[PDB]
Paper text:
C-MET receptor, which belongs to the receptor tyrosine kinase (RTK) family, plays essential roles in controlling a number of critical cellular processes such as cell proliferation, survival, motility, and morphogenesis. C-MET can be activated by its cognate ligand—hepatocyte growth factor (HGF). Structurally, the c-MET receptor is composed of a Semaphorin (SEMA) domain, a plexin-semaphorin-integrin (PSI) domain, and four consecutive immunoglobulin-plexin-transcription factors (IPT1-4) domains in the extracellular region, a single transmembrane helix (TM), and an intracellular KD. HGF, the ligand of c-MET, is secreted as a single chain 83 kDa precursor protein containing an N-terminal (N) domain, four consecutive kringle (K1–K4) domains, and a serine protease homology (SPH) domain.
Residue numbers in the entry:
A (entry chain E): 26 to 106, 110 to 301, 311 to 626, 634 to 680, 687 to 738
B (entry chain A): 34 to 55, 59 to 290
C (entry chain D): 34 to 55, 59 to 288, 303 to 383, 389 to 429, 434 to 469, 495 to 722
Write the structure that this text describes.
Amino acid sequence: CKEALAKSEMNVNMKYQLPNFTAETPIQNVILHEHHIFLGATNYIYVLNEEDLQKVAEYKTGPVLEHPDCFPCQDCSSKANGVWKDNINMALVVDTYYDDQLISCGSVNRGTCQRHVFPHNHTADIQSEVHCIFSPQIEEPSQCPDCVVSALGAKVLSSVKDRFINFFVGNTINSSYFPDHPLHSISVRRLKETKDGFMFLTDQSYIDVLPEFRDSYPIKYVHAFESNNFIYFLTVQRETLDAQTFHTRIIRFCSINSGLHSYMEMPLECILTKEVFNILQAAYVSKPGAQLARQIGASLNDDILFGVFAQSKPDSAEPMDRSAMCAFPIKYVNDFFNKIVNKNNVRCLQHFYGPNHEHCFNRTLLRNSSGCEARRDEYRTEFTTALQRVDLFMGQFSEVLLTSISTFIKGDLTIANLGTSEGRFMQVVVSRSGPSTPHVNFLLDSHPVSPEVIVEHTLNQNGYTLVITGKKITKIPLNGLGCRHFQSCSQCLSAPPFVQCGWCHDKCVRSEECLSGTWTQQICLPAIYKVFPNSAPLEGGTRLTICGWDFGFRRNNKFDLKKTRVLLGNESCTLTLSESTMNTLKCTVFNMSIIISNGHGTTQYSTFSYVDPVITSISPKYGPMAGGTLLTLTGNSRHISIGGKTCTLKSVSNSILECYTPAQTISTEFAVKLKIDLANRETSIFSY
Amino acid sequence: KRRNTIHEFKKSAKTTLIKIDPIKTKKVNTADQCANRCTRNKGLPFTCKAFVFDKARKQCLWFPFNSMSSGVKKEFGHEFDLYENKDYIRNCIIGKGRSYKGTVSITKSGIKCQPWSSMIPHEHSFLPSSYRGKDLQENYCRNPRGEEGGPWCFTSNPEVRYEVCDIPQCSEVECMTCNGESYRGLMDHTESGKICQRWDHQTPHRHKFLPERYPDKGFDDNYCRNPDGQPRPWCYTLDPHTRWEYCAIKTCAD
Amino acid sequence: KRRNTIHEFKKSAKTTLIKIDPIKTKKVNTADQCANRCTRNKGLPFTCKAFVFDKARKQCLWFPFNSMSSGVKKEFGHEFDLYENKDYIRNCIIGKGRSYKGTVSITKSGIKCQPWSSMIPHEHSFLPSSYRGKDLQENYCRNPRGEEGGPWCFTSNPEVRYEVCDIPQCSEVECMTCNGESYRGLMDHTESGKICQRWDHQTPHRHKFLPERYPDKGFDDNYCRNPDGQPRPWCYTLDPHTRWEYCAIKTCTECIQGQGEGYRGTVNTIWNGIPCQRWDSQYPHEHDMTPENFKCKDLRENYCRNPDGSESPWCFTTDPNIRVGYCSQIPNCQDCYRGNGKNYMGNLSQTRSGLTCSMWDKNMEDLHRHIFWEKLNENYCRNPDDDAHGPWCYTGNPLIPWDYCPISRCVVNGIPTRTNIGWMVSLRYRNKHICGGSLIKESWVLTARQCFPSRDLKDYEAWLGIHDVHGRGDEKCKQVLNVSQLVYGPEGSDLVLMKLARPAVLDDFVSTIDLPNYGCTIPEKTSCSVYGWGYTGLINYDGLLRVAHLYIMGNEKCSQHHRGKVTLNESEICAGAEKIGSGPCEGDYGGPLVCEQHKMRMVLGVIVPGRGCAIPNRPGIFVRVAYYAKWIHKIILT
């Protein structure tokens, strides 16, 4: 009875009290810094203490009149003619190279940024000093060095090269936005040291999609990170603009402020096996645990890129809610760019250089022989042979959309802070070696999990993971949010050791609570729920379903369904492999106790009997032969028939059986023989 | 208690092999049981692709290396009787060829095979530890699942994941002159897909011919010939059920 | 099969333990199965800390206590033999600390870690009840949670609740001498993590040594000994398949140290791939070197090392023709602590820029003609001259004679100037000023890396001899010159020189400045000034070059002012305005910090951007030319 014993499966939905902070508006970005945790949110900036998430200081970025002639950071409150638009933060960074400051980067106000300064004694008081970055470009007013961030979507990454705060920013551009005020697809900004503007060091410092492909070929960037003297980006663009099918891409260029000299795109795909996922939902860069190190072949110290690849509606960007997560050891990707693909695979880069150009026609690639040497004739490149990865979960998530991921290490295992589209926050001990079941699978909130997650691990034993869902910021102790939810012994033993708890005879429980001292984590007895049926004739070796759990020997991952046997009295009932599961048994053999022996423990169930059948009375006695009359029998999985024809069973009971007599072209009476899998004692004759 | 895996082993007598290039020896009465130790899985901590027996020393030594390797020296030590495993020297496919160990690293379309150790460009190569005794070496293409299509390997070429190495069957270079007894060949494949019985041993089916009493008619290894000139070649079977069966060989011309 | 944890037990001879203040005795044939039962979980309810068997008795009596337990009397009874649980007595870390079960009760500050049954004085003592199976000892510190930090014991001390414990690995504690046979130790593991069998045993190997027959060599339990005089002690393996193995003991790896002499290696393969014969075996050509090797190195095997301390580790190739094959494949710990070239034999042939090194010999001729420092390899970038900046190479091309091969190694509030000035070099990018620079020789200027957005020279244009950043003030001294070539400094320098298309006439209007002595170290509190072409924090600046005085401060003083935001390195100087905020900012990069030492004035630094702009009561940070003056000389010889 698989349904009934499903109570063995863990309670997916249990409610937890964790430090939960709520905002008035949706939260987009969050940054952790010096024992304060700032949040950007629609029209507002919130700074909160960690361990309580008390909104200590609030600074409000007011909704701002947008009027065409009102300049960005000049004050046009006096204007009476033109709409009270609102701003949504898309870039919140912290700088400490210059001074301990926060930088916010608004949406509506032409995408011009402002910086808050931390006083020395007190750091939360951000509202005190606020300065808006802005420099009237008198020299070349035609271009914006200060109109930084777009509206549709952007990613911003701060860095300190050469004693130089550089913002690498990517924007999404609609065709309409340009002629009013230009922007750029990927660009490199120097902050002017006097902290009152940005400069474009060279026309080379930026790349903008050519004027014609603005409305078509939109690229939206999904992640941006730095490693190994390189600044990678992760975006999603159609392989061919005409094809209109979006696919995941990666961007590489060394961090020279002069501009993006070594600019290389590569396609990235993760397949399952050959189903290929063309969309990426989120990514996180981390170092791997010891176990995974060899298992993907990476050294323990190398950077690793985790991405939740998802299948997408065909010929469209919308995810289909089928997902995967896949690991890309950064050394592998760098080798792929430099030598794994040859010149034949390489091409020019369409959206910037153009479909037809002198550069596209012919050019040597100093791809292997040189790494990043600044070239005045820098070449824009687009590869074509996607870097194929395979799933880490082997598609155990093939039906549920993933939206946010993070990863930390612990012991030797490595853990993923997965998040789905409907607000469930799993944690999985990830390994290609074994399909491992999440040890936390509670539902967080109705709204989808945001990809922006801040995780801090302290002293390797106390850490936490801020996650953002809708309007909610929550602190989850990665240390194992609990183990009360486990109810199946196998599950109790499968939960990774970093959460100290083990079975004590009835439920997975922390060690120091249940007194019986039966608390164990290595070996435990199997549990039987029920048995069907318990009425067996002496000759009947009949199909007995056994409902229970922990019916398999518990080894790391694989369950040894082979170290199982059934003892009935003294004989052993006939155990059949293909129908024996750690879920259920299907065996085929004066109340008697059945005993079930496994590789670990033996359980005793008293619900069995060797009942001896009885039949005594039949109705009718004398009658006609029409073959439609009902028959009533009585006495103590069967079948009943007369003259080679089975009577339809009108009714069933232990003590009252009703059958409709079959029609027989004869006028005499017959003793009727019961066939309960076996011809047991026949009854007497009834006059047809 | 023992298996005549010698039906698989390759025999050359009155010879010896040494590799002095920096080895396990166990005392058994029969080369068959020493081969049995080599055949037993996990039983041998080293992967012996050969071994020599001498009845005289009552000792057997087992080499984790065949004569095909470099650094081996071949000498006339008459008491020593070599034992190879023709599976490596096969360079042929037998059906699915689940037990194919040969050293071919090229595919049909001519792109190199990816090493099974390196995860680039294909990460489904985690098999070197998954299947013990797959003999899956550095690069050469095998059939670890015994999948029907043939020995396949992953290509260094990023686009194509796996492609099956084309490998010609042993039959293709084997013909039979109409008599067959003149043909002195290399096959060991009957029509019913069974491997011949060892001539020199008489177990389990007991047959009349011994190679020593009829030398130069080549009763060596288990090679289907015509000992008495039947139309097409034949041998006694290892199989307890069938006494003897033919072997099917195509014909050649010119 | 069955079970075999007797090996994990110790033993002692002819002693019986009598606990005066207290267990079962069973006629069992095998004291080994007895110990296995004691190790096996659920065999005994009580805590079987050891066992004793008397084969005269043949009665199996496990002991749930140590001899270190108080009050137990040992008794010299021949028939009785003890078997101790080496976990508790060894008290040394072995592999993971996750399951520490050793009797150590001492804090890091040398206090007795309290009885864990003692609530006094610290609350959290219910740890054995909270965690069972962790061997949460009476008083000895044990990891309770498998904490990273390890056994942390609630110190009996009133002030500190708990203080941590540190257990050394047994392998580091154990050491052997070059002979090794004289060494006696409790180490019982082979070189492959395998375990030695019990000397008394005859399984799985029935070797020759009977410890009673050959006593006096310490053949007890599984302890590694040198019975056959190998350079390392060795034992027969508990695994039947492995005949025997060497034991890893340090003296009383791969990456190479020095010429590999003290280094020792387990790899006999070379660059030709030929495996190498043992120093024990004279094979192949019966070389007399192999007997000499036994004396030459007291650490040896079939593997390859450096008994003679050759430059590349050597062995005897199985190839009879070749007597010695160099094991140069093993790596050497890519330069650190040797900024001197000769200390580094650099195996590389490619410079910073991208040009390959040339045939060293012509360069040795030319350099011996030129350079006067006082046989190094052909065409490898090891530098001969032991220069300060490290390894460097020669290039054929004239414009760049030589360059380093890339390796790892170990104004606002100012005054206008009343008078025309010569050191000032006005750098002009698309015909506007971008930075100031210093005039060194008649065709050479000194500037900063930060000031060259483009590498192109078709656009840069230098002016000399100017009082107004646009030149509207004066033109007689304005000297317009193209730019010939750019030369970058060492790596991590942020320093650059640029050389002119043509020389200049030098007169009063245009002047050069000398350079410091190689270690020229400024006195603290010395006064000197910067000259700047920057914004000057002025609503309008007419375009006069602006001067700002300054005083040198120690690196320590700037560490204090910057509050640890500066991690001061050797090459920098820090000079800071006193009680006033005035400093160079945008436009001043490449500007000269010139300090009058004794009678004349001399340049010391370059103005470079860092940590803020003109911050009051905060110093300024520059690059000291002294650390690079020699490099300036070598390059100026081009």
